Amino acid sequence: RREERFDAYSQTLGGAGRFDHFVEWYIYLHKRTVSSSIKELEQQVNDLQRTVVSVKSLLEQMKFKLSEAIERNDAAVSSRVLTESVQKSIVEKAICSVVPSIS
Amino acid sequence: TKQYERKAKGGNLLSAFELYQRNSGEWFEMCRDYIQDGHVDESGIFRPDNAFYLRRLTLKDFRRFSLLEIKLEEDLTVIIGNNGKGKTSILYAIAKTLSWFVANILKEGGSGQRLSEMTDIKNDAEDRYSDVSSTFFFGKGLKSVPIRLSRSALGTAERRDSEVKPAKDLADIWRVINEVNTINLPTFALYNVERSQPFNRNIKDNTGRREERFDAYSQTLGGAGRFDHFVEWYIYLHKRTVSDISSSIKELEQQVNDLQRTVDGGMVSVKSLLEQMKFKLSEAIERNDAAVSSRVLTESVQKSIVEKAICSVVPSISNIWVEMITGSDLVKVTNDGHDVTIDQLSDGQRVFLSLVADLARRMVMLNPLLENPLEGRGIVLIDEIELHLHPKWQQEVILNLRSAFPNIQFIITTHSPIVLSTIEKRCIREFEPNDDGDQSFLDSPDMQTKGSENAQILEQVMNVHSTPPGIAESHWLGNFELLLLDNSGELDNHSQVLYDQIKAHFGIDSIELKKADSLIRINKMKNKLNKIRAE
Amino acid sequence: MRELARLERPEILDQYIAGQNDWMEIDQSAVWPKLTEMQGGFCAYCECRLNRCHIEHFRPRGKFPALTFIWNNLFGSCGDSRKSGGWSRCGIYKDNGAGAYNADDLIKPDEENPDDYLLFLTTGEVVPAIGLTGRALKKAQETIRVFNLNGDIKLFGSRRTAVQAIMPNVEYLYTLLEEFDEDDWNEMLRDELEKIESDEYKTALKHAWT
Ligand SMILES: Nc1ncnc2c1ncn2[C@@H]1O[C@H](COP(=O)(O)OP(=O)(O)O)[C@@H](O)[C@H]1O
Numbered sequence: 085r086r087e088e089r090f091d092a093y094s095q096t097l098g099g100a101g102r103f104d105h106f107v108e109w110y111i112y113l114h115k116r117t118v119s120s121s122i123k124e125l126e127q128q129v130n131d132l133q134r135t136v137v138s139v140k141s142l143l144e145q146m147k148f149k150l151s152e153a154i155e156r157n158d159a160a161v162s163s164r165v166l167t168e169s170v171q172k173s174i175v176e177k178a179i180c181s182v183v184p185s186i187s
Numbered sequence: 188t189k190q191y192e193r194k195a196k197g198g199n200l201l202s203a204f205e206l207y208q209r210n211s212g213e214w215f216e217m218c219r220d221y222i223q224d225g226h227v228d229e230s231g232i233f234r235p236d237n238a239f240y241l242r243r244l245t246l247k248d249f250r251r252f253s254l255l256e257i258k259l260e261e262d263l264t265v266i267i268g269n270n271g272k273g274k275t276s277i278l279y280a281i282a283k284t285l286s287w288f289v290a291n292i293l294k295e296g297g298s299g300q301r302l303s304e305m306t307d308i309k310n311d312a313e314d315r316y317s318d319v320s321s322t323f324f325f326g327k328g329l330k331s332v333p334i335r336l337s338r339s340a341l342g343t344a345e346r347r348d349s350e351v352k353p354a355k356d357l358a359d360i361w362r363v364i365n366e367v368n369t370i371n372l373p374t375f376a377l378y379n380v381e382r383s384q385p386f387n388r389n390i391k392d393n394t395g396r397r398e399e400r401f402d403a404y405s406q407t408l409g410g411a412g413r414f415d416h417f418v419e420w421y422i423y424l425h426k427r428t429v430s431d432i433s434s435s436i437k438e439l440e441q442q443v444n445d446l447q448r449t450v451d452g453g454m455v456s457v458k459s460l461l462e463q464m465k466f467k468l469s470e471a472i473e474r475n476d477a478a479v480s481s482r483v484l485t486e487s488v489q490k491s492i493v494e495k496a497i498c499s500v501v502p503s504i505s506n507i508w509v510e511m512i513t514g515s516d517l518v519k520v521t522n523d524g525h526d527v528t529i530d531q532l533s534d535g536q537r538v539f540l541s542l543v544a545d546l547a548r549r550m551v552m553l554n555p556l557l558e559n560p561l562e563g564r565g566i567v568l569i570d571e572i573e574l575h576l577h578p579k580w581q582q583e584v585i586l587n588l589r590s591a592f593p594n595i596q597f598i599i600t601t602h603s604p605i606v607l608s609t610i611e612k613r614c615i616r617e618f619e620p621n622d623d624g625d626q627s628f629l630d631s632p633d634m635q636t637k638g639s640e641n642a643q644i645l646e647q648v649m650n651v652h653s654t655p656p657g658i659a660e661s662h663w664l665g666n667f668e669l670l671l672l673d674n675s676g677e678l679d680n681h682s683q684v685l686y687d688q689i690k691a692h693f694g695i696d697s698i699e700l701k702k703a704d705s706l707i708r709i710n711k712m713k714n715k716l717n718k719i720r721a722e
Numbered sequence: 723m724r725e726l727a728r729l730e731r732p733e734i735l736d737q738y739i740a741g742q743n744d745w746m747e748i749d750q751s752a753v754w755p756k757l758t759e760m761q762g763g764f765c766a767y768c769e770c771r772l773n774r775c776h777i778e779h780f781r782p783r784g785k786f787p788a789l790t791f792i793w794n795n796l797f798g799s800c801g802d803s804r805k806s807g808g809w810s811r812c813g814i815y816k817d818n819g820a821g822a823y824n825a826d827d828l829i830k831p832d833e834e835n836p837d838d839y840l841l842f843l844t845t846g847e848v849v850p851a852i853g854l855t856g857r858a859l860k861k862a863q864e865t866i867r868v869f870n871l872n873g874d875i876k877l878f879g880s881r882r883t884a885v886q887a888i889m890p891n892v893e894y895l896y897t898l899l900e901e902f903d904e905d906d907w908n909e910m911l912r913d914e915l916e917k918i919e920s921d922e923y924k925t926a927l928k929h930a931w932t
């Protein structure tokens with residue numbers, strides 16, 4: 085399942101703060117954020133599909149970006165959320181600021 | 188109301204049941220008779236007046252299928268096709284639907300199994316949902332029982348709800364009527380390729396759940412059966428057949444009477460023991476009464492039915508029995524004329540034994556009122572019926588199953604031309620070889636398969652050449668014929684070389700060489716005719 | 723199976739006498755060339771090409787120890803006890819697999835014509851001939867059962883396949899009867915019937931042609 089905004093309230097008052105959950109989540113965010121209109125993205129995906137062997141990896145990445153953009157577009161006002169790249173950066177800053185001797 | 192009364196008197200089962208529920212005698216009896224009435228055929232087989240079978244299935248954006256519609260036979264349907272055509276997907280879809288009947292027979296408002304959001308939705312479905320639509324038949328009173336299972340993809344523009352109320356309504360009739368008076372119940376089972384699994388020798392101690400009637404529904408649609416449950420249940424039946432319960436009651440009654448006399452004689456120390464024995468007696472009577480109350484077949488008869496089924500259907504097995512060896516109960520079999528344990532059976536023998544034994548167990552448990560419980564109703568799904576079977580067994584397997592279970596609707600998948608040679612073309616549903624997932628209807632083959640030669644089925648139905656194309660020698664006779672035709676039927680230097688090669692490779696009395704010889708002879712005769720005509 | 727013509731008796735059977743001598747003693751390479759003259763390198767009962775082959779006592783040495791070194795009683799049968807086990811027709815099955823039989827109710831191919839008793843269908847079954855009753859039926863039935871002429875799948879297969887190979891040529895000859903004068907067409911059929919003496923399952927091929 086995708087990460088919903090109100091997952092922030094899941095196990096918040098008991099069960100919060102397990103190392104394994106973090107590591108898994110962090111690696112996941114990293115893999116997604118390794119490497120922009122929907123119509124423009126749709127056009128780019130269509131152009132890349134027409135070209136498609138070496139560009140197949142790029143096509144898959146762009147299709148993923150398009151799906152994400154559509155999902156964000158389709159997603160509700162109540163569940164509005166910052167990009168995965170931004171989320172990652174903020175958490176990294178928090179960790180480095182708070183945890184002594186981790187820079 | 189008056190309308191329901193009219194429809195019920197016209198033979199409508201749902202109307203009769205609704206009248207029964209609102210007034211809660213005559214309506215009950217009508218419902219019970221609809222379910223229980225039947226007749227014995229000229230062949231001595233019991234036939235229900237109101238049959239229950241799956242009539243139609245429709246798949247929309249399900250796995251590989253954009254749209255698929257299948258009409259099923261009342262008795263036997265065989266689905267054939269190449270690997271990756273979706274044969275297994277079809278059985279899975281049916282099993283999920285049947286899960287809704289099973290759940291609601293067991294428990295009011297029980298939930299069956301749902302379509303997976305991850306696996307069951309077609310990858311390039313524009314509408315981003317999947318539908319499995321099924322129509323069942325239950326006699327003339329209930330000609331159509333439509334069910335739809337639906338699942339929407341994760342992005343969720345709108346939720347598509349399943350429509351399962353008709354399944355629930357029908358299952359409720361079975362459940363409620365059975366509660367008042369025991370009736371025979373339908374068997375639903377799926378045997379997928381997971382039925383192939385190693386046998387654990389360690390037989391679990393009798394907690395006592397395997398004797399409960401509705402244990403017959405326990406993982407029925409899981410794919411493997413429960414052969415372990417069979418072995419436990421069969422040993423249980425053996426122990427009860429060696430030990431009469433009423434003599435134990437009579438003996439217990441005598442012990443209670445003797446202990447009561449001792450307590451009356453002033454020995455207050457044995458009062459605790461008397462109370463324990465009275466409890467044991469009451470429990471024994473209750474079990475006896477429950478057994479009496481269940482109207483269930485005697486354990487001896489149950490055992491005999493199952494043993495006969497196994498020995499009839501499984502060719503290598505002539506006998507099956509329980510031995511007490513050392514301090515443990517062990518099932519033994521006479522396999523190929525030699526006595527062996529189940530663990531010693533070959534994988535093919537064991538897998539097939541497991542299927543038949545499991546199915547027979549469930550039928551005996553669900554059909555206590557039939558003279559032959561294996562003549563009960565139900566729907567059984569079998570994936571890859573030929574799994575682990577030699578050609579000789581493939582020639583007998585369908586006949587044996589249908590003879591042992593005459594009122595089951597079998598929906599099966601196969602890759603075997605040998606199996607197909609024993610089945611009518613009307614029962615066969617074939618995918619086209621070039622199907623790119625947009626085939627609306629599965630259809631019967633053009634050629635009659637039943638009684639046909641294997642070679643013809645391979646070529647005409649399964650689109651496989653009689654000789655392996657990637658072997659050079661497979662082409663030599665064809666090439667030889669072409670050379671003969673090119674040289675006006677005379678055996679030239681090149682044709683002679685190839686002839687000698689055929690002779691050298693296949694041998695002097697080979698089919699191939701005889702065909703070559705035949706070609707030479709016929710072409711010589713044709714040429715002689717041509718010369719006579721020219722003159 | 724064929725009507726065999728037993729012609730001349732070999733010298734070695736004079737030397738060995740029943741009671742004193744055993745069949746393990748006698749040299750077999752002396753006996754064979756006279757049988758190979760009679761039988762044409764084909765089996766007595768089924769008519770396969772002999773490759774693994776043994777000398778067979780038509781009436782066996784256990785039940786009939788008097789009939790042991792008798793030229794009438796000997797035949798060249800397909801199969802071998804020595805080289806491999808589990809042969810399933812002809813000599814070997816008569817003893818082992820065919821259980822109880824009266825040897826009087828079997829076709830002896832040197833004495834009798836088999837063609838009056840046996841019929842070979844082009845579908846590859848051998849059946850009793852059309853219109854037999856009593857003993858004549860019982861011989862036909864027991865010959866088929868005891869030599870296992872239908873029940874050996876290897877044999878049933880081979881014979882069926884051999885005939886089905888020639889059935890285009892049979893079909894085609896009997897179309898040309900229309901066109902030709904008698905003596906040319908009778909020469910054509912004489913020729914085809916000449917070739918099949920070199921062939922396996924020659925009786926079954928005859929019934930297809932004639
Ligand atoms: N969700 C899906 N979307 C598209 N194609 C799928 C999906 N799930 C399975 N398939 C396809 O279905 C086929 C598997 O069907 P299956 O029933 O397992 O075949 P078989 O007829 O051998 O039993 C594969 O060719 C696969 O590409």
Ligand SMILES: [Zn+2]
Nearest residue numbers: 765768800812
């Ligand atoms: Zn022979």
